[PDB]
């Protein structure tokens, strides 16, 4: 079908765009030795997560849909594990970057001078990935038994389990990001100059990309559709969006991009 | 370790030890905040440097180390040099702030102070360094204004048409003439401050008396604001 | 000035334990790597152990490996050598040597006084052959000493790592020539050195009564360090 | 009046000097060197980048051997580098953080440095204690030190912020000779291949040629329009070059008093911070305030290449005595060695 | 003041000392510089550089 | 080679007029900002007027504003100062100074005790 070919080409295009963006960010980090700051490490972590999800999810997702291809139990389990771990790692990297910005804004004098860090940035980078894994990995590995209609984690039957899972990756992270951005905006306004617009769209894009799936799955479990696919794609497009906002607005990666390009 | 002699690995190890010592020195260097003090012969910067040295504790330079709220400040004052600043001032293009002391009660040499502020503000290499302005000797200025013998309109002909701005929060108990004169003098400097600053660097006008114990707190707050603005500019927030 | 004083020697029973302390005074101790050098009553010097600056790297001889431990106290300016389970082959005099390593450095410049100790009752090695053990000669005439190495001592840097040491009777050896061409500080221009990758020659233009004693060859290519047999020059 | 008579006499003498110089102006240097083949494109690539300085670099100097190097940074550091392996041989902290100059003894046994403090400190490298000490501290200048160059192990010429330059005596610490001829701050000096004469450039747009032994000025060259920030002596010892705040490098001759050639471009509007000559003297390398360095064909005033990219204003530039590599340091914390490609 | 008079006298003496030196033609100086530059052309590794085999920096 | 020669200025009654000229040689007149400074008897050098490269920006000291007018002729390399209604306290030596560097918006050390790029000066005496 022509529609299937066009859809496959569109997913290939978005995967290639993710490839290009994250490869450019990682290349900028690698080439320049000036980007050895903590924020540079956080941006590298986010870029690594987005590059890995672009590598793993979509290319293996092509045969699963609109194609007469089947995936075994091990392959499907690995695909789900990688997808969930990478998504949670991206969310936690976003939260870490927001916390770093909050610390810089509210503790500027100590952020500049009384802030030295080595082998401790890597500690946080490992910790966020470990927590991202522990959110879902053991859960789905146990859920292998509870389940061949569709390659799914198999815990969608339990509503409370889904609520617990969505609580540790969408409610608390959004609350923390909103709290950090609100504190930064309030401190800067007390001390509406296009700062509010950016600090609002930063949370708005994340919420718009992540809420629909995390709520549609819950309401379907409590009581597929095209809107289900739309929500899944909205969740995936956050990985596309992320390279444009965070690493491209730090004034350090911009210098490397200007020099190289 | 490949194709390296037994006497080359030891040299590499010595270099690595030197590098680790350099890292420790870099941490210590980043810990401290450097400032550059500037003033004329009648400015009175000696009193300020003494009061912030002793209380908070031939050669071509003087160094004063103080500490406020567990924050370490290193103030550098040029001495025993010549009267041409266009060559040795480019050394101080990385300091956190330029403290600039101006004698407000000296109308005759106020134009000289304005010219020095203009030249410092618009310099090619000092175009990203904030200035903390100390308008010293407020008591003498108030006494001169109260005396009425000398008129500011003689040196600045636009003072006669200047009226103090409304809602300027005058200090309660101060004469209106003294407040008007002080606000005019600060106006003369904020014009140069905002003429071509463009937000890259800003100026902090302050009034200082003969014996004031709050100068260290003022410097600390101005430095805090300077670092906050630098951090905001780093993340492209503003 | 510069002083290295050793202590801790004595008479011990076989299989016992002992400790030597080498105190360094008059120079920056922390910037110098340290070596222990053992000289038996029989002629010949043997390298024992080495510790770098900051104790980054430690090297031992294949004989004392597993029984000797070398450490250093920089704040106390002291070098420790502890031995356990001694044998009858460890009875000798121990010298404390210092060495600094950079581009133009002069390793093995100063040697300690040394402490004597008596006991009751090979693939990765480079050999040195000094055939002329004893050369008798009246002073005032030129003197030539020859050294040979089984392996070429010339590295890819162009540096040939060969060292010449002088031991006059009753005193620890002092460095004369380092890296086969250079002259150590405080050494008269009478001593000269040259040679190819394998054979090396040391010349004393005008002999004096001071130069009587033993001459020792050494290499610094691979860290197992082998001294020469020792050529004895006498009147 | 006596004052007006003296001024008129000075004007008459200046007119006579200018008339003699114009009389000697037979033909320009550009006219004579016009049939020689141009060099072409001079592409030099970076071979080494040396890191370890915590602030801007103000000075640098090669050793007599073309391997070891010394650099000075205003964080208060004097670092000695083995350029072949990028190793650090020594790292000497300084009493004063403001250091504007650095020198390396021709014997390799000493280094020297000075700055905003009107003191030149000489450090001994070869010590029996294994550490670098402060061998001497020469004081007596009443201004910041701009340059210092070693003559022997026991002699050194310094130029300071005041109008004077001085030849010292390291063993005794007293100025053997004082020159005191300039009007503005002296910013650079260059020793001749045989150390009998040396030139000094200052902030009055004039260069002076002094005789070391007699301590008097021989010739004064005035072709520039602004302060001179650098000077370099021709390899054959019969000419020199000067770079100034205006975007111009001027080549002056000794036997013929006047000026030979001018190196400038329409697109260049910044100042020159340093100049240097190659071993043959055909090329002249000049570092600019726009974070770049230019290579001028000194016999034709044609730019033959650009060393591009240092992230901050280029401060110091030097060429090895062997002529193999060019070392460049900027207000960035890094020092780069550049070499050609066959 | 007498200081200005003394400085003017010193400047006049310096100008008199500088004005009496001998100057060669610019053509001769140009020829000398060109000859020196041509003579040492082969010993300038910054011109037609040496091969990477013998280049100390790589 | 940088030479600035000042002409004009003599005995002038109070309320009179004068015009000082400054001829420049050795440098491109169009690339530098120019200043007029003065030295009163028993007083230090005092900045009195300033004109930019193209004459677009002009500044005065305030005690001469409305009485003094500065101008520059880049075609003939001249700097004019027209002084109107001279006060008895205006007796001083006037120097035509050049800013140290080209294409700069700041000027350093123009009123220094010694300066390489300053003229010899012209005497302006006001008496009655
Ligand atoms: C998904 C699997 C394969 C890897 C999970 C960890 C990844 C995402 C992260 C966690 C910590 C990271 C490391 C932390 C520190 C550094 C800095 C520098 O030394 C090079 C990269 C390196 C070494 C990072 C490489 C990527 C890294 C290993
Ligand atoms: N790709 C969707 C991953 C996820 C996380 N939570 C729910 N779904």
Residue numbers in the entry:
A (entry chain R): 12 to 158, 161 to 204, 298 to 329, 336 to 373
B (entry chain A): 2 to 58, 181 to 361
C (entry chain C): 1 to 121, 134 to 247
D (entry chain B): 2 to 343
E (entry chain G): 5 to 62
F (entry chain N): 1 to 128
What did the paper state?
The histamine H4 receptor (H4R) is a potential therapeutic target for chronic inflammatory diseases such as asthma and atopic dermatitis. Since H4R is mainly expressed in hematopoietic cells, such as monocytes, basophils, dendritic cells, and T-lymphocytes, it has been reported to participate in the release of cytokines, and consequently plays an important role in anti-inflammatory and immunomodulatory activities. Here, we show the cryo-electron microscopy structures of the H4R-Gq complex bound with an endogenous agonist histamine or the selective agonist imetit bound in the orthosteric binding pocket. In the overall structure of the H4R-Gq complex, similar to other GPCR-G protein complex structures, the Gq trimer bound to the intracellular region of H4R, and Nb3522 and scFv16 bound to Gq and the Gq-Gβ interface, respectively, thereby stabilizing the complex.
The H4R-Gq complex structures, H4Rhis and H4Rime, which were bound to histamine and imetit, were determined by a cryo-EM single-particle analysis at 3.0 Å and 3.1 Å resolutions, respectively. In the structure of H4Rhis, the primary amino group of the ethylamine portion of histamine formed a salt bridge with Asp943.32. Hydrogen bonding between Asp943.32 and Trp3487.43 was also observed in H4Rhis, and the loss of signaling activity of the mutant W3487.43A indicated that the stability of Asp943.32 is important for ligand binding. The TM7 residues of Phe3447.39, Gln3477.42, and Trp3487.43 are located within the van der Waals radius of the primary amino group of histamine and form hydrophobic interactions with it. Furthermore, Gln3477.42 forms weak polar interactions with the imidazole group of histamine. In H4Rhis, Trp3166.48 was further coordinated to the bottom of the ligand binding pocket and exhibited a stacking interaction with the imidazole ring of histamine. The imidazole ring was stabilized by pi–pi stacking interactions from both the upper and lower sides, with Tyr953.33 as a lid, in addition to Trp3166.48 at the bottom of the pocket. The nitrogen atom (Nτ) on the third position of the imidazole ring formed an ionic pair with Glu1825.46, suggesting the importance of Glu1825.46 along with that of Asp943.32 in the binding process. Thr993.37 is involved in pocket formation, and Asn1474.57 contributes to the stabilization of the interaction with histamine by forming a hydrogen bond with the neighboring Glu1825.46 and regulating the coordination of its side chain, as observed between Trp3487.43 and Asp943.32. Asn1925.46 of H1Rhis and Glu1825.46 of H4Rhis formed hydrogen bonds with Nτ atoms in the imidazole ring of histamine; however, in H4R, histamine exerted a stronger interaction with negatively charged Glu1825.46 by establishing an ionic association.
